[PDB]
Amino acid sequence: ELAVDKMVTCIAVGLPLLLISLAFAQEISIGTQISCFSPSSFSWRQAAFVDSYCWAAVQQNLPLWLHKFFPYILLLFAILLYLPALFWRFSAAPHLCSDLKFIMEELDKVYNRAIKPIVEQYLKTKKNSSHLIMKYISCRLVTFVVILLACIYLSYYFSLSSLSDEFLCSIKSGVLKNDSTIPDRFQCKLIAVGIFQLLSLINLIVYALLIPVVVYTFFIPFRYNDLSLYNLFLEENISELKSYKCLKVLENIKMLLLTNL
Amino acid sequence: ELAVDKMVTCIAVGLPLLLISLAFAQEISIGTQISCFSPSSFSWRQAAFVDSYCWAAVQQNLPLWLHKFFPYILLLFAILLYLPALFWRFSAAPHLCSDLKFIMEELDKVYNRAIKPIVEQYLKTKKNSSHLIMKYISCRLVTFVVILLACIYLSYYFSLSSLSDEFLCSIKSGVLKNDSTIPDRFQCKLIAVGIFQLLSLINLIVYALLIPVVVYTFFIPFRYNDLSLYNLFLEENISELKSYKCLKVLENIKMLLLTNL
Amino acid sequence: ELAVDKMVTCIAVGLPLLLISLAFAQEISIGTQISCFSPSSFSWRQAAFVDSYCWAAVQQNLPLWLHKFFPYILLLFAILLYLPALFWRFSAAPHLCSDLKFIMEELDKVYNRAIKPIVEQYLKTKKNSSHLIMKYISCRLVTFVVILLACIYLSYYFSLSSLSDEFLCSIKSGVLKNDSTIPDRFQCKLIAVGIFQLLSLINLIVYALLIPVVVYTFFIPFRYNDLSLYNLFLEENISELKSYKCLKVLENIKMLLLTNL
Amino acid sequence: ELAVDKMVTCIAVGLPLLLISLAFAQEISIGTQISCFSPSSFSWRQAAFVDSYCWAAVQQNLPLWLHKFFPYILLLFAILLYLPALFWRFSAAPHLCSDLKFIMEELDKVYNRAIKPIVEQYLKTKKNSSHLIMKYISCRLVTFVVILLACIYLSYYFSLSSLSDEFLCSIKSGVLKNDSTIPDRFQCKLIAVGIFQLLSLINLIVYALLIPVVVYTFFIPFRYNDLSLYNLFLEENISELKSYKCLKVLENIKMLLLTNL
Amino acid sequence: ELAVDKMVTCIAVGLPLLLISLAFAQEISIGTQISCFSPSSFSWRQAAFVDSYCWAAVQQNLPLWLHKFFPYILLLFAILLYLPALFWRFSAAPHLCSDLKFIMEELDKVYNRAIKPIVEQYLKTKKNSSHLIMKYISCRLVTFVVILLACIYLSYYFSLSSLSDEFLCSIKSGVLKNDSTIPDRFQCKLIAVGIFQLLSLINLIVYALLIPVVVYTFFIPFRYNDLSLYNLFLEENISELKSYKCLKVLENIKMLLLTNL
Amino acid sequence: ELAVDKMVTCIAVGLPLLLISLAFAQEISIGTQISCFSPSSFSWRQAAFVDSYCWAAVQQNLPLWLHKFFPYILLLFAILLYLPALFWRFSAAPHLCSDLKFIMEELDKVYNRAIKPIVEQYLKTKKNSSHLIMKYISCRLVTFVVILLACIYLSYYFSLSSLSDEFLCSIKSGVLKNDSTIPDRFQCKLIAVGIFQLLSLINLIVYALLIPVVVYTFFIPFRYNDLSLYNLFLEENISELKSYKCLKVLENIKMLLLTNL
Amino acid sequence: ELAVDKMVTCIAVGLPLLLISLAFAQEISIGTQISCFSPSSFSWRQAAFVDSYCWAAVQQNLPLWLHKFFPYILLLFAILLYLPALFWRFSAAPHLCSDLKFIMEELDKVYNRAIKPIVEQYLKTKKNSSHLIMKYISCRLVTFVVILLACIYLSYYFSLSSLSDEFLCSIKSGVLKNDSTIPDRFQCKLIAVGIFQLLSLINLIVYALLIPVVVYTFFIPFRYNDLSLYNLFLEENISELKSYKCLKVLENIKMLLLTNL
């Protein structure tokens, strides 16, 4: 598993969940996302009914609608970022685990036979496939696209969120539209939206790292073949290879040394 | 266990539980699902009694009834999705575990004997049964049907939920129907229903993936026999087979190689 | 341990605990199970005293009494379902564990001796006892009876719960019967009863599966002896038998194969 | 450890802790165990002071006193039931663990010597002691006595609890006895007592099982010596004896069988 | 580690922590330990200020002062009981662990040499020291003294707690001594003190067991030397000695038996 | 991993998370970060609306804006400090783990060959690279820079926070700007800012340790090459080297000793 | 690790964290640390604003300022006590672990060679260094100094805390200094300060043990060299030495015994 992309993924997941959990902790801290005026004649309950009404009224200036739903959309993005990892955890990971374990021992046998090519034949045959490299391309890029719409959404959010912290709510509705004690609209403040707009900029800012970093992961001709992706697995899993390290030190140095190694 | 279908199942379970837990966290965040007006003359308690009354009144426009019960119905679907896995965990899983473990060693003996057919006789005998393939068909499809009614329910919910966010509640009832201070009906907002209608669309949208994906799992003639289902277990459990990987690399390459392998 | 009956048991326990925990979570969500009117002249506390009074008044139309106690009765059923498993975990499980472990090795010796009858003598002697089969019958059926009264209770509950969501409560009592500001009865809504009546139907519906399923477990002549119950342990614990699987494959196929097996 | 008595003990502990925890969860759910009227002129705080006063007044019709303290007395019984197990866990358990482990191997040597008496000499010497059997008698019976007083207490509780759900509380006390706005007594409802009286009957009912069951455990002449208690350990720990099972099967069947066994 | 004294210690720690945690759970359940009257003219906040004031006023009839601090003093005793175990866990436990492990193998060698005295020389040399026995005496007795003052404190508490459930509080203080709307004293009820006085009697009653039991642990001449304390470790750690059990059975019976043993 | 720098890092992370968690616990303890006056004519809800309004108004004297966002900025710094460790955990840690494990065994072979140079050739070749030392420099310094801006931010915060604990808030806004009952501005206290300003000084003070300590970590010429960084890994991982310790003791002492060693 | 000093440290850390956590639990129990009067004309919110204002006003008789910040200063001391252990865990612990493990085996070889001096040469060379003994001196003493200022702080706290439980707060400030309904100062009670002053005395009292105990740890000439500190490690880690125990028993007794040992 490619660590940076994995770490980027792990971090990309941590941020919103943190933000969401804190928003929840803040929603737990605030208790409501909105409030409105009332007449002072509105009882302690009557005003509570207004607040809850307008909090419900949101689904009927369009961002004012979205402003309520904003946090859960974030959660949607978080889930949408996570699942490609579980998907990728099966698109390719079951293949490579077998691949590496084979690759290791045959190169160790190349190493061992040198001390005293089936993986190369296999690997330069994996060269033939475009399937698993395109598996990587699609799985990563799709995940990347999740970030794009979030950032665009957060941008389209933030840009207009800056001007739409408040609205006037009517609860003069139905039969109790006829109650004149209800002002035709209450003015209402979308309490969390400033936090969210801040949170939005925060997440957006950090996500503006993750996007081109994953883009950087595709410049493999400068980092076209599964081999080139195996070369990533090489650049990756050299991590696993004692004999490579030994032979790389040998290569660094260059049967006595092999006898000493 | 078929990973995608398993993952689909694991995910299909995660979503509603997440949605339900957040709805609970939201119910914990909101504290009530409904409120109503009162006269300002209704005490801080008297108005509370109205709210609770109408929250109870729900069981006596029919979706307004269902709107209350909505979340727990979701929980019902979640349980209804889970149990087929535990059921399937015994319909077939005890069979295949023994099957695979047998299949492995005899094909390894085919492999070993080749290096220096009982599973094939067994497998091409499993070809005879329709019982375990029909076990799969029913167990999966039933689980799939759980999704169907949920989505239909959420659709029948959402389509009319869009118009029925509120109602007028009468608590002028019994002896205290005679109290004229009680308005014959209070107007009442079904606070969570917008969230739920959103949540409904969310779950519906994601479930509209899971359904045809499981449908795709049945196109085995393009992915009629337990063997064909064993061919799935083949396409599955090749995951387990060192010698297959070795022989597939051998097959990729093709006694020296067997001696080297 | 018979998986379906065990799973049925595990599930039969999960449902009410879930329902109860959610009812608790709902009781935590609602904070009270009941409320009543008051005069508006009843203070914010005075009305609270009414509510709590009537919530206490329940123990003095009889289901209105029971309606309060309803949840804990559910908990009673849940405990009553659980303990037969712990009881059964000792009525028979210590016997069979020794039985199976003996049975395995001697049939493996039959298997081994065939490759190159004490369990049969023992098993066809276990044929003599009615004690352990009657242990099963009673332990299961008793557990089953727990379900019967619950469902009957929930039915007797639900059928009249449908009509008795509310009552009028008198707190004009004792010395403070003489306070005329207290209405001779307050009208009172049994807030949770609708949820409970829903919950009751839910649990009842699901329990109407578990009952005849366990009944189906007794049709052993179509699924009279401990052997017949050992035949269940056979139909069960063939799960454990490598050699049975081998010999069943051998039986499927039919010393070379035994030499190959 | 004698499973039924142990299970009975484990269950006997589970019930009250469950009841207590739920009572706590109910105390958490209710927030107070009592309330009283007030004049409506008593402030939202002044009435709160009454409630808390009378909740404190309890220590100065005697069961009304006890009714408050009731739950913690239950907790007392629960602790009082638990500790005899820890006590018994040392009164006898360190002895028998060594005893069984010795007994096993020497009877296995009797078994082994038969294949190709020190425990019997030891056991029929343990016959001499009355100390460890009286250790059992006292430790169990004492635990049993805990149940007796609880049930008697719950009975003496329940029988009069049925009539004493409420009382009149005076907070006209000290200097602020002179405040005439305070009614000489407030009427007060002991909110939890109905639950507790229910809980009391529940626990009592279930404890009326546990008592005679433990009594049944003493009818050893029909289930006088440590041997007879070792015969219980026999009837118990035959659970541990492979060779007994083998020899019991041999005994069931009856050197070839010993050679086969 | 001496089990009874250890168990006594473990239990002696469990009780107050339980009582304290429940008091906390009760403090969490009650929310305040005290309340007072107010004029009804005192606002919902003004009366709250009184309550909190008098709750603070406690530090300026002396037990009324202590009554507030009571719970944490209990916590003090609990910590004060615990730490001697950690202290004792190093005063002696590192010595004896080495001692026992040595003692075992040399007596096993006495046992083994008998089959086919250094510990006795060592032990009857440990006879010389008074240091480690006085380590026990002081460490235990000190712990015991913690109990004494608690019980005395609880007694001095309880005896006067019985008469001092309430007091009159002045918040007519400082500049706002000049506000005549403040009554020169409010009457105030020390809400938890009844629970605490109950709790005090409870803990006292149970601690009146633990004290003389530990006293009973010192009657070693009837249960003067480290050997006598080693004789306790003997009476203790015979628990560890296979060969003692074997030789005690041998001693019970009395080279064939040694050959059989 | 360099322990001090690691410990410094671990501690540098612990402090703010502690401060943040306590601020959250304090936000949980306070429930709001701000409040304002109202007219007494503002209802219990109307004043609540003011408070929440002004709490939202923050995003429209600039530090008053920032004062709200302050805590989450701290959280930002905490995350910003953490991730360089995970980054560094891959920038270098996969290299050195292989390096050390190689280095150990070859120096042990130097040790072993001495008893009866490939690592030196490798290490004095690592001398060639500037890549991994610059990896350290950048990764640490960047982390260090996180501290700089925090401290500067906290300074720019604290210095002006000292004068800007409060502000006047206008909620006379929109349509409900026209309500004259609303004072054109409410005066508002930024409740947490004193805690935060304290917290700021606290964190700043402690961070003024961590900064130059990490600076001290760069004075390697007094603590220019990867070798010099390997000399740190030497000064570090001598921790791992038995033979170094042995040979250092040998070096301390100086084939008999090697034969004795 | 020196157990007493370690235990002293572990305990020294436990106490404040306990006190702090309980203070938090008390802050959670109280909900506020302060309250003030208001005019009764101050709304339920207006008075709340006063309370929060004065709670914020603290940062502008100086101990009244500190009284708020008191708990977190305790937390500061707790952290300040902890970190020297982690520091010491690296100042010396990595050295001694290697030291002991070497020391053991060479003295075991002295033991073994005696049965049939490199550590002594090493140890009496460690005699040369003052570095690691001064490491101990500074690390411990610094930790000790943390206690000093806390106790002094708590003393300077307690001594004046005794007289400064309350103050008068002005919220007549800014524009809303001009509101005459605000009393020029409210009188305010620093609710927690009595608990804290109690807590302060508690912690101080217990810390007055820990200080001279650690002082007692320095009287090594009566408990000047690393050897003398190794003699502590001797007096310490004799805990680890089987052969020392054996040879100490041998020394207690004094090749047969060595042959028997």
Side-chain angles (χ1 to χ4, degrees), chain E residues 8 17-18 30-31 38 44 50 99 102 136 141 171 202 206 212-213 226 229 234 252:
Chain E
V8 166
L17 293 178
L18 167 147
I30 305 155
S38 73
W44 168 208
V50 185
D99 291 323
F102 160 74
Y136 170 83
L141 187 71
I171 107 187
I202 288 167
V206 178
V213 165
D226 289 4
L229 178 58
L234 165 73
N252 173 189

Tab-separated table of all heavy atoms in Angstrom, chain E residues 8 17-18 30-31 38 44 50 99 102 136 141 171 202 206 212-213 226 229 234 252:
chain	number	residue	atom	x	y	z
E	8	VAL	N	-9.765	-8.677	52.799
E	8	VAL	CA	-10.229	-7.629	53.704
E	8	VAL	C	-9.818	-6.268	53.173
E	8	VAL	O	-10.631	-5.344	53.082
E	8	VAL	CB	-9.673	-7.859	55.122
E	8	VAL	CG1	-9.866	-6.621	55.968
E	8	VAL	CG2	-10.352	-9.049	55.776
E	17	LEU	N	-15.201	3.358	48.016
E	17	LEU	CA	-15.203	3.790	46.628
E	17	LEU	C	-16.575	3.594	46.038
E	17	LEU	O	-17.092	4.462	45.329
E	17	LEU	CB	-14.178	3.001	45.826
E	17	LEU	CG	-12.726	3.255	46.188
E	17	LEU	CD1	-11.844	2.369	45.335
E	17	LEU	CD2	-12.397	4.717	45.987
E	18	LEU	N	-17.197	2.470	46.366
E	18	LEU	CA	-18.580	2.271	45.988
E	18	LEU	C	-19.441	3.359	46.597
E	18	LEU	O	-20.190	4.046	45.895
E	18	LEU	CB	-19.021	0.887	46.448
E	18	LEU	CG	-20.498	0.528	46.441
E	18	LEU	CD1	-20.641	-0.938	46.132
E	18	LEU	CD2	-21.098	0.822	47.803
E	30	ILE	N	-28.529	14.293	42.564
E	30	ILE	CA	-29.204	15.396	43.237
E	30	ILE	C	-28.863	16.731	42.595
E	30	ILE	O	-29.718	17.611	42.478
E	30	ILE	CB	-28.849	15.388	44.730
E	30	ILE	CG1	-29.179	14.029	45.337
E	30	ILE	CG2	-29.679	16.423	45.448
E	30	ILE	CD1	-28.351	13.708	46.557
E	31	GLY	N	-27.610	16.899	42.181
E	31	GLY	CA	-27.108	18.136	41.637
E	31	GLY	C	-26.641	19.153	42.661
E	31	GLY	O	-25.744	19.946	42.361
E	38	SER	N	-35.938	30.962	49.940
E	38	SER	CA	-35.750	32.367	49.630
E	38	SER	C	-37.098	33.034	49.809
E	38	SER	O	-38.131	32.355	49.844
E	38	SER	CB	-35.253	32.583	48.197
E	38	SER	OG	-36.298	32.347	47.271
E	44	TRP	N	-35.463	33.456	40.313
E	44	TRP	CA	-35.036	32.129	39.908
E	44	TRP	C	-33.517	32.061	39.938
E	44	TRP	O	-32.932	31.030	40.279
E	44	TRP	CB	-35.668	31.882	38.528
E	44	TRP	CG	-35.270	30.736	37.635
E	44	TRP	CD1	-35.341	30.737	36.272
E	44	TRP	CD2	-34.795	29.438	38.005
E	44	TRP	NE1	-34.920	29.537	35.769
E	44	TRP	CE2	-34.581	28.720	36.811
E	44	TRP	CE3	-34.524	28.814	39.220
E	44	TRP	CZ2	-34.109	27.418	36.800
E	44	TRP	CZ3	-34.054	27.521	39.204
E	44	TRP	CH2	-33.848	26.838	38.005
E	50	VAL	N	-28.445	32.456	46.451
E	50	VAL	CA	-28.503	32.084	47.860
E	50	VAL	C	-27.976	30.675	48.056
E	50	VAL	O	-27.054	30.440	48.846
E	50	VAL	CB	-29.942	32.204	48.381
E	50	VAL	CG1	-29.978	31.935	49.870
E	50	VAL	CG2	-30.523	33.553	48.032
E	99	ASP	N	12.253	-15.379	48.574
E	99	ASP	CA	12.258	-16.351	49.659
E	99	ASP	C	11.505	-17.616	49.281
E	99	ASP	O	12.064	-18.718	49.302
E	99	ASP	CB	11.615	-15.720	50.891
E	99	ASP	CG	12.453	-14.618	51.483
E	99	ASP	OD1	13.690	-14.756	51.481
E	99	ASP	OD2	11.876	-13.620	51.959
E	102	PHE	N	13.123	-19.681	46.439
E	102	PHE	CA	14.210	-20.448	47.034
E	102	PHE	C	13.695	-21.573	47.915
E	102	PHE	O	14.104	-22.732	47.778
E	102	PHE	CB	15.094	-19.529	47.866
E	102	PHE	CG	15.916	-20.262	48.872
E	102	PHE	CD1	17.020	-20.999	48.486
E	102	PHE	CD2	15.557	-20.249	50.208
E	102	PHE	CE1	17.765	-21.685	49.417
E	102	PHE	CE2	16.295	-20.936	51.133
E	102	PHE	CZ	17.402	-21.653	50.741
E	136	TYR	N	5.660	-6.091	58.774
E	136	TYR	CA	4.258	-6.482	58.716
E	136	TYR	C	3.435	-5.778	59.779
E	136	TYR	O	2.410	-5.157	59.475
E	136	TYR	CB	4.137	-7.993	58.876
E	136	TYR	CG	2.718	-8.472	59.071
E	136	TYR	CD1	1.873	-8.669	57.988
E	136	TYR	CD2	2.220	-8.726	60.345
E	136	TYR	CE1	0.569	-9.110	58.167
E	136	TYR	CE2	0.920	-9.165	60.534
E	136	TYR	CZ	0.097	-9.352	59.443
E	136	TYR	OH	-1.195	-9.797	59.633
E	141	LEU	N	-0.922	-2.536	60.893
E	141	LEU	CA	-1.536	-1.784	61.980
E	141	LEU	C	-1.817	-0.351	61.561
E	141	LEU	O	-2.894	0.186	61.837
E	141	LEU	CB	-0.635	-1.813	63.211
E	141	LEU	CG	-1.207	-1.221	64.495
E	141	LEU	CD1	-2.292	-2.121	65.048
E	141	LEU	CD2	-0.106	-1.029	65.523
E	171	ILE	N	-26.712	35.179	54.022
E	171	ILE	CA	-26.024	35.737	52.868
E	171	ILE	C	-26.117	37.245	52.841
E	171	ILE	O	-25.479	37.894	51.996
E	171	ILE	CB	-26.524	35.111	51.551
E	171	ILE	CG1	-27.401	36.067	50.750
E	171	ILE	CG2	-27.241	33.801	51.825
E	171	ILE	CD1	-28.037	35.412	49.561
E	202	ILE	N	-23.498	2.729	57.477
E	202	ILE	CA	-23.197	1.578	56.639
E	202	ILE	C	-21.710	1.274	56.674
E	202	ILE	O	-21.288	0.168	57.030
E	202	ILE	CB	-23.650	1.868	55.202
E	202	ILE	CG1	-25.172	1.838	55.119
E	202	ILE	CG2	-23.002	0.891	54.245
E	202	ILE	CD1	-25.712	2.420	53.838
E	206	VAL	N	-19.744	-1.966	58.455
E	206	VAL	CA	-18.903	-2.927	57.758
E	206	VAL	C	-17.459	-2.830	58.224
E	206	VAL	O	-16.771	-3.846	58.376
E	206	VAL	CB	-19.019	-2.702	56.243
E	206	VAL	CG1	-18.105	-3.653	55.500
E	206	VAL	CG2	-20.463	-2.869	55.803
E	212	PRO	N	-11.446	-5.836	63.819
E	212	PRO	CA	-11.037	-6.970	64.663
E	212	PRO	C	-10.579	-8.179	63.877
E	212	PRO	O	-9.780	-8.972	64.392
E	212	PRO	CB	-12.305	-7.293	65.464
E	212	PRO	CG	-13.402	-6.805	64.614
E	212	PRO	CD	-12.888	-5.575	63.956
E	213	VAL	N	-11.050	-8.340	62.642
E	213	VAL	CA	-10.511	-9.376	61.766
E	213	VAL	C	-9.014	-9.195	61.553
E	213	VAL	O	-8.233	-10.142	61.700
E	213	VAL	CB	-11.265	-9.374	60.423
E	213	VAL	CG1	-10.496	-10.168	59.379
E	213	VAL	CG2	-12.671	-9.946	60.593
E	226	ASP	N	10.063	-14.139	62.768
E	226	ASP	CA	9.885	-14.172	61.324
E	226	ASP	C	9.500	-15.573	60.901
E	226	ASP	O	8.636	-15.757	60.038
E	226	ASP	CB	11.156	-13.746	60.594
E	226	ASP	CG	11.438	-12.273	60.724
E	226	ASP	OD1	10.696	-11.586	61.450
E	226	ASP	OD2	12.392	-11.794	60.083
E	229	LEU	N	6.148	-15.750	61.291
E	229	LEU	CA	5.582	-15.105	60.121
E	229	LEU	C	5.818	-15.932	58.865
E	229	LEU	O	4.964	-15.979	57.973
E	229	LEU	CB	6.193	-13.718	59.988
E	229	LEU	CG	5.729	-12.929	58.782
E	229	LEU	CD1	4.223	-12.774	58.821
E	229	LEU	CD2	6.415	-11.581	58.747
E	234	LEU	N	4.092	-20.168	55.523
E	234	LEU	CA	3.865	-21.597	55.390
E	234	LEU	C	2.377	-21.868	55.304
E	234	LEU	O	1.888	-22.426	54.316
E	234	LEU	CB	4.470	-22.324	56.593
E	234	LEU	CG	4.065	-23.777	56.842
E	234	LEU	CD1	4.715	-24.700	55.828
E	234	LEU	CD2	4.390	-24.207	58.265
E	252	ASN	N	-0.042	-38.263	55.222
E	252	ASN	CA	-1.375	-38.792	55.463
E	252	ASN	C	-1.372	-40.310	55.364
E	252	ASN	O	-1.989	-40.994	56.188
E	252	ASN	CB	-2.351	-38.187	54.451
E	252	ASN	CG	-3.748	-38.796	54.507
E	252	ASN	OD1	-4.576	-38.511	53.643
E	252	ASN	ND2	-4.040	-39.569	55.547
